[PDB]
Amino acid sequence: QRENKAVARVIISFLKYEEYALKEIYNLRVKKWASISDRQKDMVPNYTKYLANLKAAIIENGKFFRSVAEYALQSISFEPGEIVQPNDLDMSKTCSLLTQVYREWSAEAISERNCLNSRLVPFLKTLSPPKADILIPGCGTGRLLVDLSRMGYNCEGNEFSYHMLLVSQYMLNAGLLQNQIIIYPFIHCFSHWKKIEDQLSPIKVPDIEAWSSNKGMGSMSICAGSFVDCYGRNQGTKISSHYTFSRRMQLSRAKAENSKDVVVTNFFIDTGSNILDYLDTIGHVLKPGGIWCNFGPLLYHFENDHGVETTYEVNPYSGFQDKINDYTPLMGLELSSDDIISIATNHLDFELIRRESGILCGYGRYAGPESCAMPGYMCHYWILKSN
Amino acid sequence: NQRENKAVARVIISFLKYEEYALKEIYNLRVKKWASISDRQKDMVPNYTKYLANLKAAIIENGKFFRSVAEYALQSISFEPGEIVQPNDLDMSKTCSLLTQVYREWSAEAISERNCLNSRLVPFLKTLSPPKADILIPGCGTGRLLVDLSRMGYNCEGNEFSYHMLLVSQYMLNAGLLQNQIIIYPFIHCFSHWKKIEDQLSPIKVPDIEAWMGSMSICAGSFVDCYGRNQGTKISSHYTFSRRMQLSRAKAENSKDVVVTNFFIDTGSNILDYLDTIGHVLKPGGIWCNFGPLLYHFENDHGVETTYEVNPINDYTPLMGLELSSDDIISIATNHLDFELIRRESGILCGYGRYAGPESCAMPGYMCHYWILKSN
Numbered sequence: 001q002r003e004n005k006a007v008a009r010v011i012i013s014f015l016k017y018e019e020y021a022l023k024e025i026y027n028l029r030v031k032k033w034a035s036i037s038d039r040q041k042d043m044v045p046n047y048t049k050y051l052a053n054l055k056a057a058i059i060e061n062g063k064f065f066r067s068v069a070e071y072a073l074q075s076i077s078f079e080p081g082e083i084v085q086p087n088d089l090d091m092s093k094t095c096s097l098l099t100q101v102y103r104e105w106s107a108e109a110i111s112e113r114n115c116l117n118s119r120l121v122p123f124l125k126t127l128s129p130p131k132a133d134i135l136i137p138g139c140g141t142g143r144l145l146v147d148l149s150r151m152g153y154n155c156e157g158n159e160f161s162y163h164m165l166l167v168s169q170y171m172l173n174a175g176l177l178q179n180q181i182i183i184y185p186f187i188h189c190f191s192h193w194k195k196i197e198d199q200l201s202p203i204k205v206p207d208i209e210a211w212s213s214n215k216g217m218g219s220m221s222i223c224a225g226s227f228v229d230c231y232g233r234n235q236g237t238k239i240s241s242h243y244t245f246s247r248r249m250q251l252s253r254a255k256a257e258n259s260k261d262v263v264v265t266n267f268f269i270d271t272g273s274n275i276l277d278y279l280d281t282i283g284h285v286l287k288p289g290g291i292w293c294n295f296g297p298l299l300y301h302f303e304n305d306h307g308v309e310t311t312y313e314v315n316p317y318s319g320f321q322d323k324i325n326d327y328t329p330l331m332g333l334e335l336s337s338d339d340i341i342s343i344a345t346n347h348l349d350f351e352l353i354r355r356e357s358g359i360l361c362g363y364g365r366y367a368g369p370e371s372c373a374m375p376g377y378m379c380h381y382w383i384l385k386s387n
Numbered sequence: 388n389q390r391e392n393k394a395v396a397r398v399i400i401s402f403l404k405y406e407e408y409a410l411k412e413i414y415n416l417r418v419k420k421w422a423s424i425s426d427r428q429k430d431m432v433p434n435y436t437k438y439l440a441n442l443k444a445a446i447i448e449n450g451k452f453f454r455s456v457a458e459y460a461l462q463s464i465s466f467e468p469g470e471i472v473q474p475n476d477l478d479m480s481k482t483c484s485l486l487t488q489v490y491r492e493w494s495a496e497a498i499s500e501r502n503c504l505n506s507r508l509v510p511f512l513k514t515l516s517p518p519k520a521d522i523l524i525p526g527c528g529t530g531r532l533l534v535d536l537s538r539m540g541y542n543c544e545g546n547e548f549s550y551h552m553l554l555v556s557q558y559m560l561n562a563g564l565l566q567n568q569i570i571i572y573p574f575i576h577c578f579s580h581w582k583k584i585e586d587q588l589s590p591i592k593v594p595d596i597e598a599w600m601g602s603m604s605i606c607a608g609s610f611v612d613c614y615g616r617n618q619g620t621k622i623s624s625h626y627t628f629s630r631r632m633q634l635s636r637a638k639a640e641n642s643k644d645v646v647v648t649n650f651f652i653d654t655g656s657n658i659l660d661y662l663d664t665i666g667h668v669l670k671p672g673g674i675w676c677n678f679g680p681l682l683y684h685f686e687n688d689h690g691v692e693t694t695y696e697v698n699p700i701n702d703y704t705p706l707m708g709l710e711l712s713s714d715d716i717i718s719i720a721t722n723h724l725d726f727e728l729i730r731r732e733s734g735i736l737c738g739y740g741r742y743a744g745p746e747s748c749a750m751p752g753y754m755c756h757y758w759i760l761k762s763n
């Protein structure tokens with residue numbers, strides 16, 4: 001399937017991390033050291049030992065990605081035609097998974113995760129029914145699904161990146177022991193260091209032990225696909241790259257209507273080319289009286305993207321696609337916090353329940369005692385209730 | 388010479404094209420996006436077209452600022468239409484970023500951001516440094532710190548190799564601007580992080596101070612080229628060996644009491660050349676003050692340059708590499724360049740052109756390093 005071609009590319013990308021990282025961050029720095037004058041070499045006498053340590057760290061990270069790949073390979077059978085090589089974007093995504101894994105599965109990143117948990121968890125425990133059905137769009141490798149399902153909620157994550165999905169199935173189902181894996185997730189960042197040894201900091205993952213998903217006590221599932229495709233409205237939503245009209249997705253959207261008690265968007269609401277599709281989908285999938293909790297920045301992903309996609313409408317009489325627009329820009333609709341909440345309250349029958357602005361929180365941020373990494377984002381937080 | 392003038396002409400043309408570029412880049416596709424969404428979602432954003440009209444108006448105003456800077460420059464430069472190189476998208480993007488730079492250096496709103504450095508540098512200079520001392524400011528941008536320090540009676544030389552910066556600088560320093568004479572809209576190219584979309588269209592008055600008591604001058608060129616060592620330095624893109632530059636470097640040795648690097652030490656492909664130049668240009672007993680992040684500009688650049696030697700060759704000299712930590716920079720300065728550590732602070736959060744309005748959710752800024760080292 002097309003799914004299998006994508007998965008193959010990601011698995012090969014995992015297997016090739018070491019070679020790519022050596023080429024990308026190691027080789028030219030050996031060449032740079034070699035090219036400076038002996039006089040300048042003496043100013044940095046430990047540079048070559050540093051580069052040896054950086055190479056060792058790359059090899060360890062390669063061991064992690066190889067283990068994830070082998071785990072995926074125990075359950076996927078290809079075709080000769082379905083094995084396609086990864087491009088450079090695949091390799092960069094694989095390198096950034098180190099940051100994602102640090103963020104979602106290390107003890108050092110606990111406070112960064114507590115920005116959201118410290119606000120959402122008290123609210124859920126006191127005012128929302130465990131057990132409840134919670135949907136988590138753009139769930140990443142799925143830490144939040146573990147935390148919430150361990151409180152007894154039925155948690156469905158949604159994720160369209162196969163990089164994320166493959167790491168996710170590894171971290172959730174491989175039976176990892178607490179602190180089993182040592183990775184070096186900061187070695188691709190060469191900036192902001194007070195002490196260079198911090199860049200080579202070892203990080204143990206996962207920071208939590210395995211716990212069973214038990215029927216009737218909080219489960220986990222995942223829609224692999226685009227959010228709007230999996231759960232969108234079945235009428236009135238333009239078809240695009242992120243919205244298809246095949247029978248499968250029409251059925252998934254039909255069963256998705258009023259199916260969730262809670263939607264939690266966490267660094268997600270700003271990821272799309274049309275946030276209004278996201279708002280429509282949240283209102284569709286939530287029951288009356290359900291709550292949408294959002295936490296994260298408003299850093300619009302396509303703000304500088306001048307690409308265009310193709311959009312259509314579904315003809316009511318024929319059911320066929322119609323009203324073709326092949327010049328639909330990806331940029332646009334970069335809405336403010338106030339306008340998102342105002343659209344929800346005045347057009348989608350929501351009532352504002354909680355709101356906080358300017359919550360400084362990092363994303364995969366180095367958190368050591370002398371950290372000077374980029375401080376993070378000013379995050380917006382709100383809870384709206386459908387009615 | 389000729390290359391210099393061609394470069395200046397091209398930057399001037401970029402200024403003249405700001406309006407057309409900004410319309411293409413941030414306006415047109417958003418009108419097309421509004422036009423393309425369904426009528427129901429259009430009803431979700433009823434003020435969007437009024438917003439786009441206000442955005443176009445702001446673009447017009449910023450274009451007026453850039454045209455004024457360009458014509459001021461055009462009172463001294465003549466160029467054939469055919470000899471001018473057409474600006475590329477990087478030139479236009481730098482021109483758009485000048486809005487942020489001008490906000491940072493010439494608005495009242497950016498005072499606290501400038502005060503991260505000023506609150507530490509000014510007391511140190513007043514208490515511990517000679518009156519009318521000679522101060523060098525590498526990568527000085529549009530030159531606000533030169534005005535601030537020269538107004539305290541210090542003789543200030545700025546150094547800046549970007550003609551975007553230089554042209555705006557000569558405008559802000561040498562034209563006849565009155566305080567608050569200009570209205571720009573410096574946040575309109577950022578569509579993210581807004582609590583209120585009106586904040587994106589905030590008008591900003593510049594300049595908050597009159598430029599026209601020490602003197603002020605500027606070396607237009609690369610820092611290491613203007614003031615580097617004359618022996619033992621590799622010839623590169625940022626180091627030339629013409630008799631001009633050899634001469635300037637000869638007159639540069641032990642010519643300055645203070646070097647102030649402000650968001651500069653991380654801009655080059657070889658920070659050791661920067662340290663060599665700082666140690667060279669400072670007198671014994673001179674002060675190097677540094678403030679800023681360690682965000683290395685070429686960390687992800689896989690390009691290579693060409694460097695060679697003369698008595699009186701490598702075509703694969705990478706730009707990346709030597710991304711040194713704070714501790715290692717200070718340790719190289721003290722242990723190899725005869726410096727003594729005098730002051731130091733790490734993790735000073737400070738913005739760079741940060742929107743500072745009442746409901747700001749703009750990126751918080753950088754975790755900055757600060758130090759004072761004394762040559763000996």
Ligand SMILES: Nc1ncnc2c1ncn2[C@@H]1O[C@H](CSCC[C@H](N)C(=O)O)[C@@H](O)[C@H]1O
Nearest residue numbers: 138139140158159160161226227266267271
């Ligand atoms: N249209 C869409 N449908 C499903 N997932 C999406 C999506 N657009 C982006 N994503 C996913 O959303 C995530 C944004 S990053 C945030 C990951 C996670 N929620 C966390 O806070 O750590 C990525 O995993 C990205 O692949």
Ligand SMILES: Nc1ncnc2c1ncn2[C@@H]1O[C@H](CSCC[C@H](N)C(=O)O)[C@@H](O)[C@H]1O
Nearest residue numbers: 526527528547548549552609610649650654
């Ligand atoms: N090799 C070099 N020689 C001289 N100037 C340089 C340089 N590399 C970068 N610069 C300049 O250094 C500045 C970095 S941005 C900071 C500008 C100013 N000091 C401020 O704090 O606002 C830019 O103006 C850039 O053009």
Ligand code: NA
Nearest residue numbers: 258283284286
């Ligand atoms: Na619903």
